[PDB]
Amino acid sequence: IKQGIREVILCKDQDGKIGLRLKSIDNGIFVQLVQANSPASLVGLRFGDQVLQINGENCAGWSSDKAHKVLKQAFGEKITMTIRDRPFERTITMHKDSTGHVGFIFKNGKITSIVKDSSAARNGLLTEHNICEINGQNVIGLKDSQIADILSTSGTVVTITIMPAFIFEHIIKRMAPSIMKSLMDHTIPEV
């Protein structure tokens, strides 16, 4: 969660795509899906990110639909965006013990308990929070087993980005878990 507003410059691909779906939330506009191998994944857009401006025009109060139209009607050449970094999320750094545990239970990407005298507990991890990212990789809609795999194959230090479930549920409104398994970019960023 980078403290402030940054600017990104996008460029439609050969197919006129940027790779983005956006959701209206509390009169802001927020990133709902980022597509693998897309302009939006290259420039580093993330689920949860707020779009402040599109080409210098303010997004406040737009509907998802208007946001999507604005994007279609734009000269592919160069689309600027003003981004606030994942405003609804926090990042929690934890350390695995010698058993390789951090100390929580989660179900359907949702944390549901903290284990006494874990790092998770020492670190104030919260239940009723959806796991958005692990070690900077988006994990939304992967099966629980594959999240365990990512935690299990991780270094000792584990960084998790979480979002209040009521907010999370508002963003992904009416989506299958396997929709986002398919569509959401789950790669480590290129350098």
Ligand X SMILES: CNS(=O)(=O)Cc1cc(C)on1
What is the sign of the dihedral through the CA atoms of 114, 46, 151 and 172? positive
Under 8 Å between Cβ of 6 and 52: no
- In the bound state with ligand X, the residue whose beta carbon lies nearer, of 107 and 174, is 174
Cβ-proximal residue to ligand X, closest one: 174
Any binding-site annotation on 13?
A: no
* CB-CB neighbours of 164 under 10 Å: 15
Cβ at position 21, least distance to ligand X in Å: 5
Any binding-site annotation on 97?
A: no
**Residue 32: which of 111, 141, 147 has the closest Cα?**
141
- In the bound state with ligand X, the residue whose beta carbon lies nearer, of 45 and 94, is 45
- In the bound state with ligand X, the residue whose beta carbon lies nearer, of 4 and 16, is 16
Cβ at position 188, least distance to ligand X in Å: 23
Any binding-site annotation on 143?
A: yes
Burial of 185 (0-12, 13-18, 19+ CB in 10 A): buried
Residues that bind ligand X in the complex, under the rule CB under 6 A: 21, 33, 173-175, 179, 183
Q: Which two tokens stand for residue 111?
A: 């944390």
Cβ at position 19, least distance to ligand X in Å: 11
CA 155 to chain CA centroid, Å, is: 21
Beta bridge mates, 34:
20
Cβ at position 180, least distance to ligand X in Å: 8
The continuous run of DSSP H or E covering 39 comes out as: helix 39-43
- In the bound state with ligand X, the residue whose beta carbon lies nearer, of 148 and 179, is 179
Rounded distance, CA 39 to CA 44, Å? 9
- In the bound state with ligand X, the residue whose beta carbon lies nearer, of 21 and 46, is 21
Cβ at position 183, least distance to ligand X in Å: 6
Binding site per annotation, positions = 108, 143-144
